[PDB]
């Protein structure tokens, strides 16, 4: 339900300074530099379908799955004599 | 004043007097010399439709 | 279990900005009422000046 | 211009080939001092002339890898490379900065590039002793890791003004002054630069990185395969972007990778094997004048969104493929199965 | 008014207290004035995909065409090359076949492609010195 | 994405708006050098009491408010909204909100008095600018110029 | 007492938490559970690699 | 050792002595976004994998092992 951030009227208030970065922050600086690299690499800003995240999601699970190999490898060269 | 405007050109541009200090108007003051002007009036005095 | 805990600090954040307008509220009136009504004291200073019988039948 | 440019090249090749062959510490010493006047020429004019300003700093570049390469006494071996690497990377880092564009970012990006590269593995050949099947897969995975990251990574070389995102409570995000906005045409020529540049540094990497892989005669089938796959996937990467001179360079890939193994092939004594590589660059060129005689055929409007998606789904396979086969050819699964 | 092939001449200028002569060609030109303003904008990735093309000419056709003609004149040397080394080095008749074979079949390509594209049919007459010459 | 997608469309549509009303603007004020080739045209003296630009004179080229009006719809009350959408709607509500460059004009049918400071040459150059922009677009039907000076 | 009352009351005393050693409420991010939190899964790290050694060790000889 | 300790006190007095000449980058206001999530990333995974080292240094693992 409630979501709201009304503005504050009181002078003598705590002004927030400092502030950290919140899930939401990080996922849409995350999304805006998917956007930027696509408008550079390519001359989409539309983001219909993004080739770029594909290429780094794709050697990213080149290496997730050398890593489950070395690690099962590993696990049944202990286990088995 | 809005009606009866003070302007100020002596930067390379104009600044009207508004309450408190000068506001700027215009960026780039066109300014012709005189010799330009003379053209143009000559140019002018051909036509008359009075 | 997020999804109430994101609901609650959502509210009570909106409600800790609404006590501090609320607050503002509060000390706007009482910093009109206390220009009104000063303490005792204070009422010798009044005589004598641009405020000395200000108050008329429309406040 | 051309004469001193000239000057330099010449007298870097003579010195090179005087300090390898006589051994003579005069090879050093006049390749120093080319060197030291070229960069110092180049760091003079740069504010007189634009082009000859660039145009030294690029061709300093020679002189300096020869110098670097030769300053370790001794034998020749794995930190003279690191060396020579270690000065190109610095050198263009230098030249890069300083100057609005002119298509020398783009050249100095990549030279930039591909020498904190071959850097890194020439560090770890240095540092400890590895087969050249170790240094070939580091090369082709550097360079793949590069090219896959070119986009974002120019972007944020180009020093693009930050994008601001305001959490909740924080106050309004104030619009940036209207210099930057301004200044914006500059900066994303110097993106496209940096992306051209980038791009190039990583298919020089991975051409460096396949040939080392495959000039030897026992090189294993996997070899083959790392390498076939990374010019696959370096030809398949020019469907993704969409400037010219990246395409151009994502294609030619595979060209200069049969160049390199045939030229590799013919300087060992593997000549059978150069007259393959011969027809296989030929086959290449075959495909290419197939794709230029007909603008019919790559084209991506001559084909469905089936096959679109089946070319699509064969680049993601190969590039994800590309690196645990990369560690199975060296052995890292062997070590940890015998531990 | 202006000096044919420069800058023109300033208004305000006397004829005379401008470099002029007798017998000087001058063209009519429109005085010099600067852009109106470039593109303001504030989206950065929409700024990326404008001002590229300024200087971006899609992939299309012509590039392919440009680096086919490209990879074909480096096919014809590198093969040249590979194909007289092998020839001196083992002299087992292949390279001088192979030679032979790239020298005829691009001074034929050279006479094909004729009237097809004039620059292409020069580039490869020209670059076709090396294997003629390597096989004679 | 979608919103940003919609946001370039809309700022492309205000581009258009004010290039629409920058190609407006260099229509009826063009520059003080090109006054002296109007004369003797189809637009010798064009401006009559039921144009839009009857007798504003171009006082040079100043960053001026996007005539039309550009506005969000409501529901923007205090309920927090997407912090990159609304960043983004925030630049474009910025930057777009100005033509930036755009010859403006003094109404001289709204004033009165005209007191100009500065220095001379720099005053009279302005004011002879005023003036050339004024006569070489108005007949003699509907304007006239009257001076008094020292010389 | 409910899943509700006692989330409601480790909640407001991680607000309090924040609002001691932070010095903001809004509890957009609660960087003070990330360190706790963090701290506690590696005590679980702990705990499961120790009955992993257990196990491991009931396997060999 | 005694040498070594007061170099790294030196380095540490140097990345003080950093921080506050300039005051912009002394103040992660001025860091980007997935720099602070990593420096956030590095915290965390340190602190956490701490006591799992902690209790291998002494000898937790290597009593399960053997009882």
């Not at chain 4, 082009?51 to 700093?57: G, I």
Request: proline share 6%.
């Amino acid at each position: 339900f409630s979501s709201r951030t009304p503005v504050n009227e009181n002078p003598d208030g705590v002004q927030y300074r400092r502030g950290f970065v919140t899930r939401h922050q990080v996922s849409g600086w995350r999304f805006v530099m998917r956007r930027i690299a696509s408008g550079v690499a390519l001359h989409d800003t539309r983001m219909l379908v993004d080739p770029l995240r594909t290429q780094s999601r794709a050697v990213l699970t080149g290496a997730l799955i050398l890593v489950t190999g070395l690690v099962g490898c590993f696990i049944f060269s202990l286990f088995r004599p | 004043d809005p009606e009866r405007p003070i302007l100020r050109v002596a930067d390379g541009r104009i600044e009207r007097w508004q309450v408190g200090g000068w506001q700027p108007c215009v960026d780039v003051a066109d300014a012709m010399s005189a010799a330009e002007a003379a053209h143009i009036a000559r140019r002018l005095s051909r036509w008359d439709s009075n | 279990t997020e999804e109430v805990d994101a609901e609650r600090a959502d509210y009570l954040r909106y409600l800790s900005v609404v006590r501090d307008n609320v607050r503002a509220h509060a000390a706007e009136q009482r910093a009109a009422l206390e220009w009104s009504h000063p303490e005792p004291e204070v009422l010798a200073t009044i005589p004598g000046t641009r405020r000395q019988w200000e108050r008329d039948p429309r406040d | 211009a051309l004469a001193l440019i000239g000057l330099i090249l010449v007298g870097t090749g003579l010195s090179v080939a005087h300090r390898v062959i006589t051994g003579d510490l005069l090879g050093q010493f006049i390749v120093s001092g080319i060197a030291l006047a070229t960069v110092i020429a180049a760091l003079a004019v740069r504010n007189r002339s634009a082009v000859l300003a660039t145009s030294l700093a690029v061709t300093a570049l020679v002189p300096v890898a020869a110098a670097f390469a030769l300053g370790v006494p001794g034998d020749f071996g794995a930190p003279n490379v690191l060396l020579a690497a270690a000065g190109v990377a610095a050198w263009s880092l230098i030249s890069m900065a300083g100057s609005p564009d002119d298509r020398g970012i783009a050249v100095f990006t990549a030279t930039a590039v591909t020498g904190v590269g071959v850097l890194l593995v020439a560090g770890a050949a240095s540092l400890w002793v590895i087969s050249s099947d170790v240094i070939g897969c580091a090369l082709v995975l550097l360079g793949l890791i590069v090219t896959v990251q070119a986009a974002q990574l120019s972007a944020m070389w180009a020093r693009f003004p930050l994008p601001v995102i305001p959490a909740p409570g924080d106050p309004t995000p104030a619009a940036r002054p209207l210099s930057v906005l301004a200044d914006l045409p500059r900066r994303v020529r110097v993106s496209q630069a940096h992306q051209t540049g980038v791009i190039a540094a990583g298919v020089l990497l991975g051409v460096a990185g396949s040939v080392a892989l495959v000039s030897s005669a026992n090189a294993s089938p996997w070899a083959w395969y790392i390498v076939v796959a990374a010019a696959a996937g370096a030809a398949l990467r020019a469907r993704v972007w969409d400037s010219a001179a990246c395409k151009a360079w994502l294609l030619g890939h595979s060209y200069l990778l049969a160049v390199a193994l045939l030229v590799a092939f013919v300087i060992g004594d593997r000549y059978q094997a150069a007259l393959w590589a011969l027809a296989a660059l030929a086959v290449l060129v075959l495909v290419w004048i197939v794709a230029a005689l007909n603008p019919k055929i790559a084209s991506p409007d001559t084909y469905s969104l089936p096959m679109r998606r089946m070319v699509g789904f064969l680049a993601t396979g190969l590039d994800a493929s590309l690196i645990p086969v990369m560690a199975l050819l060296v052995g890292l699964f062997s070590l940890v199965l015998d531990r | 008014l202006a000096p044919i092939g420069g800058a023109p001449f300033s208004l305000d200028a006397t004829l005379d207290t401008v470099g002029v002569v007798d017998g000087d060609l001058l063209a009519l030109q429109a005085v010099p004035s600067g852009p109106p303003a470039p593109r303001i904008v504030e989206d950065i990735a929409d700024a990326a995909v404008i001002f590229s093309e300024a200087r971006r000419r899609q992939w299309g056709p012509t590039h392919i065409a440009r680096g086919a003609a490209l990879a074909l004149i480096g096919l014809i040397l590198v093969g040249t090359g590979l194909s007289v080394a092998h020839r001196v080095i083992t002299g087992d008749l292949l390279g001088q076949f192979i030679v032979s074979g790239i020298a005829l079949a691009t001074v034929i390509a050279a006479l094909a492609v004729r009237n097809r594209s004039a620059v292409l049919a020069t580039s490869l007459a020209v670059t076709a010195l090396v294997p003629v010459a390597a096989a004679f | 994405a979608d919103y940003l997608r919609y946001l370039s469309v809309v700022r492309d549509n205000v581009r258009a708006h004010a290039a629409e009303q920058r190609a407006a603007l260099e229509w009826s004020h063009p520059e003080p050098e090109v006054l002296a080739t109007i004369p003797g045209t189809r637009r010798q003296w064009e401006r009559d009491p039921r144009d839009r630009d009857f007798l504003v004179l171009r006082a040079g080229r100043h960053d001026v408010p996007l005539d039309a009006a550009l506005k969000v719809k409501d529901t923007a009350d205090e309920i927090d909204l997407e912090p990159v959408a609304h960043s983004a709607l925030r630049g474009l509500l910025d930057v777009q909100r100005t033509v930036r460059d755009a010859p403006t004009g003094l109404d001289v049918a709204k004033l009165a008095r005209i007191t100009v400071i500065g220095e001379a040459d720099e005053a009279r150059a302005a004011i002879r600018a005023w003036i050339a922009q004024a006569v070489t677009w108005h007949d003699p039907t509907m304007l006239g110029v009257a001076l008094a000076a020292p010389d």
